[PDB]
Amino acid sequence: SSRVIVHVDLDCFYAQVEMISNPELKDKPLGVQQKYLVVTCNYEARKLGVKKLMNVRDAKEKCPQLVLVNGEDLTRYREMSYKVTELLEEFSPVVERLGFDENFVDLTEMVEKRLQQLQSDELSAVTVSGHVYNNQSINLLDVLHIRLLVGSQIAAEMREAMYNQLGLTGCAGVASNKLLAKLVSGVFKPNQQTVLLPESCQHLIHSLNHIKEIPGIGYKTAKCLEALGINSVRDLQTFSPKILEKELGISVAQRIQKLSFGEDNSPVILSGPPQSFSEEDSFKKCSSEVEAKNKIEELLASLLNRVCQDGRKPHTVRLIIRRYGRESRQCPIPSHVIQVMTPMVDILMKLFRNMTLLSVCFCNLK
Amino acid sequence: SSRVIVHVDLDCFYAQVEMISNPELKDKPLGVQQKYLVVTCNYEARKLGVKKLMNVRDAKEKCPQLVLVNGEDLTRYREMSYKVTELLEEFSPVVERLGFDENFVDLTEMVEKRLQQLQSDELSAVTVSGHVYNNQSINLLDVLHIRLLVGSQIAAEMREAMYNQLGLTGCAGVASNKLLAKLVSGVFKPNQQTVLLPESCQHLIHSLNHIKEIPGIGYKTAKCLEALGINSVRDLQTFSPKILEKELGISVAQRIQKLSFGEDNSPVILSGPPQSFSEEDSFKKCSSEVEAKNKIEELLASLLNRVCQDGRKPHTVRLIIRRYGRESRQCPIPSHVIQVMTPMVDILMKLFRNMTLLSVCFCNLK
DNA sequence: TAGGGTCCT
DNA sequence: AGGACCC
DNA sequence: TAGGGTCCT
DNA sequence: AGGACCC
Numbered sequence: 001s002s003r004v005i006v007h008v009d010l011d012c013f014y015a016q017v018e019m020i021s022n023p024e025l026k027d028k029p030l031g032v033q034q035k036y037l038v039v040t041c042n043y044e045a046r047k048l049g050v051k052k053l054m055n056v057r058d059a060k061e062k063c064p065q066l067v068l069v070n071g072e073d074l075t076r077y078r079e080m081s082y083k084v085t086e087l088l089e090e091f092s093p094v095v096e097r098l099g100f101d102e103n104f105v106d107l108t109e110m111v112e113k114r115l116q117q118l119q120s121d122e123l124s125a126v127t128v129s130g131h132v133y134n135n136q137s138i139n140l141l142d143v144l145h146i147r148l149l150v151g152s153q154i155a156a157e158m159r160e161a162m163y164n165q166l167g168l169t170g171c172a173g174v175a176s177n178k179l180l181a182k183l184v185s186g187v188f189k190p191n192q193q194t195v196l197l198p199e200s201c202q203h204l205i206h207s208l209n210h211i212k213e214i215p216g217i218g219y220k221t222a223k224c225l226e227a228l229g230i231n232s233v234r235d236l237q238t239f240s241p242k243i244l245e246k247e248l249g250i251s252v253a254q255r256i257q258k259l260s261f262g263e264d265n266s267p268v269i270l271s272g273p274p275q276s277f278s279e280e281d282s283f284k285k286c287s288s289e290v291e292a293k294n295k296i297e298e299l300l301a302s303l304l305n306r307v308c309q310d311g312r313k314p315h316t317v318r319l320i321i322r323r324y325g326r327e328s329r330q331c332p333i334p335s336h337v338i339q340v341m342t343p344m345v346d347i348l349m350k351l352f353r354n355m356t357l358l359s360v361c362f363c364n365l366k
Numbered sequence: 367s368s369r370v371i372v373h374v375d376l377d378c379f380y381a382q383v384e385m386i387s388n389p390e391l392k393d394k395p396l397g398v399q400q401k402y403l404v405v406t407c408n409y410e411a412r413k414l415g416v417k418k419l420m421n422v423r424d425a426k427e428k429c430p431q432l433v434l435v436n437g438e439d440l441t442r443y444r445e446m447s448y449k450v451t452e453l454l455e456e457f458s459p460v461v462e463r464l465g466f467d468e469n470f471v472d473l474t475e476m477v478e479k480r481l482q483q484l485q486s487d488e489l490s491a492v493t494v495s496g497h498v499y500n501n502q503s504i505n506l507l508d509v510l511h512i513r514l515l516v517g518s519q520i521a522a523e524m525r526e527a528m529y530n531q532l533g534l535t536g537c538a539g540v541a542s543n544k545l546l547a548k549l550v551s552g553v554f555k556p557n558q559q560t561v562l563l564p565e566s567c568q569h570l571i572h573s574l575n576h577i578k579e580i581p582g583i584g585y586k587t588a589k590c591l592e593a594l595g596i597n598s599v600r601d602l603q604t605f606s607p608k609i610l611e612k613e614l615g616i617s618v619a620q621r622i623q624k625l626s627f628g629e630d631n632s633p634v635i636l637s638g639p640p641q642s643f644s645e646e647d648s649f650k651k652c653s654s655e656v657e658a659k660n661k662i663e664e665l666l667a668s669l670l671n672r673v674c675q676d677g678r679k680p681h682t683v684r685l686i687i688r689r690y691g692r693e694s695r696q697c698p699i700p701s702h703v704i705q706v707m708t709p710m711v712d713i714l715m716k717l718f719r720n721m722t723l724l725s726v727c728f729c730n731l732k
Numbered sequence: 733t734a735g736g737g738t739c740c741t
Numbered sequence: 742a743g744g745a746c747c748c
Numbered sequence: 749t750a751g752g753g754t755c756c757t
Numbered sequence: 758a759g760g761a762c763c764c
Contacts, residue, residue, distance in 0.1 A: 034734045099748030218746050250716055251698045280735050330757050332617045350616055400750045465764030584762050646751050696741050
């Protein structure tokens with residue numbers, strides 16, 4: 001029943017991809033911006049004081065030289081993101097993506113095949129690769145320690161390969177479920193890896209400073225938990241099941257409470273090809289509601305070649321908006337047109353009618 | 367690109383199944399009732415004046431003797447319904463169910479395989495089986511006439527088989543798409559079949575007296591079409607695309623207008639096993655909101671053995687209600703419990719809280 | 733936030 | 742269609 | 749309606 | 758979760 005999961009987390013992904021593109025930014029502190037924000041930056045930059053999501057001022061002006069590169073167009077990041085997942089799929093087919101820069105891989109079957117291959121004696125020579133969370137001592141007679149170490153060796157091989165084959169660095173964490181792998185992958189932040197032995201599972205989970213830090217608990221649940229006095233992970237562990245059950249629902253409640261103990265039985269799901277392709281433009285009020293339809297052909301133009309590219313074709317289109325909350329108009333894509341721009345353009349137009357930012361989404365792929 | 371579709375429609379299905387069960391009702395006019403209604407009845411009954419969905423009074427008292435059998439419990443109907451579909455699947459794998467007593471089968475591939483088998487001469491001997499809609503003349507040199515006739519021969523074989531193997535009678539209609547097959551299957555109502563040649567497609571579609579009669583157009587669309595002056599099928603054929611587009615949406619609009627011409631490109635979809643299992647009880651106000659939870663264990667008890675039976679197990683439960691409009695509380699089914707009553711019972715209870723008729727639905731099968 | 737994406741209700 | 746969660 | 753069911757938004 | 762459509 002016990003698993004060996006790895007979580008692979010790429011350092012400052014977009015900046016890595018931009019530094020690979022213009023090398024002259026290698027030494028230089030680098031910010032990737034979209035609109036007014038520095039959504040990410042390389043280490044130099046971060047060191048000289050910057051954070052994911054500061055103002056191109058509160059941050060340019062917080063610092064020198066700061067090179068800015070525009071990262072509005074996600075295309076290259078999205079391609080590199082899939083190169084990484086495909087590489088990890090080669091290790092073990094079941095890989096789950098979480099945004100463009102994180103992947104979970106279930107290493108359970110692969111660890112077991114390795115251990116079977118190892119003869120009677122070299123098993124005592126199995127070592128760790130990377131850090132051991134909390135500096136915990138290994139016990140070579142613990143079968144679970146031996147699996148998690150083999151799991152740290154797969155992880156180092158994945159990271160070596162992502163570096164040798166794609167030029168990317170990244171962190172990894174090995175643990176017995178997704179929550180823990182993800183919590184432990186960032187303990188040694190830059191381009192390193194860590195492995196979580198079971199005896200340190202409470203230490204990790206209690207190293208959190210707020211339940212918002214638990215993946216699975218977002219902006220809302222957190223605000224609600226607060227309203228009940230629950231603030232630390234230990235308040236959530238000890239809070240009353242009932243009262244919680246009867247406030248967040250049995251589902252929400254009885255899952256987030258297991259999380260608070262480090263227990264998480266959710267499988268790593270095979271993500272495979274994406275379920276949708278969309279594009280977007282912000283513009284703090286810039287749609288006169290009228291003129292701004294040209295932005296609509298915009299988005300289509302890019303999308304169409306993406307949607308094409310795939311093979312698979314979309315059976316639904318959808319349009320989305322915001323106001324000086326979002327709204328969406330869903331609709332089937334007419335038969336024969338799947339098989340160019342011009343028809344589409346006008347399906348999207350009336351959709352527009354039936355209704356600070358705009359988007360087209362192509363979904364329901366077949 | 368042209369298809370041969372059959373639509374198979376069983377006569378007064380529940381009554382057939384009840385007449386097979388108690389033979390003494392064979393000669394006798396038979397009503398199947400659920401609560402206060404005669405949801406269906408055998409021909410004798412219908413003849414001596416009865417209709418699908420009259421009051422057990424406005425109808426018992428509209429007529430003699432009238433035997434009543436309770437059809438609240440759908441179990442036997444549901445089993446016989448699947449026996450019928452499985453039989454038709456044996457002819458050609460792609461069969462779509464529409465409620466418990468109707469099935470569409472795409473006979474395209476099977477008709478073509480038959481025609482290929484027929485040598486050069488016997489092709490002139492191909493005949494029809496059953497009625498030809500509108501008494502239309504056949505043209506043996508029309509490839510489309512020849513396909514639809516072979517299609518009427520498959521249809522007679524299906525009906526013979528449903529009769530010989532399962533004791534059920536029924537109607538069939540063969541046509542080039544689902545709309546037309548379904549419109550034409552009831553032209554000779556009792557236990558007969560009809561085939562639609564293309565030249566009579568407008569005659570059939572114009573034989574309708576209201577656009578509500580077009581499968582695809584329901585209670586709402588109809589009321590809306592009316593609000594625009596559209597009443598006959600010919601008003602809908604001739605109504606303006608735009609105005610219609612810009613009232614029902616492009617999707618709704620441009621599909622129902624094709625229907626009004628007898629054009630319908632929707633594929634017969636393989637229904638396979640069901641996507642959900644649910645049970646229900648009416649009771650014009652009888653839930654004190656409190657006591658009535660016993661009805662909840664009720665429904666579960668039956669369901670559980672159904673859900674079991676299948677193989678596949680449900681990952682979601684859901685509860686539904688009405689008021690002296692419906693409401694549903696959706697929720698995941700806790701891991702380990704999939705693998706009895708007692709846990710469930712209480713998951714359903716709190717669901718109850720977060721909130722003339724009651725139901726449990728098990729869905730999201732895996 | 734930005735510019736994506738995913739699953740549930 | 743909209744809500745919630747993730748990066 | 750009753751007692752089911754299915755797909756879309 | 759609720760709307761619309763079918764039997």
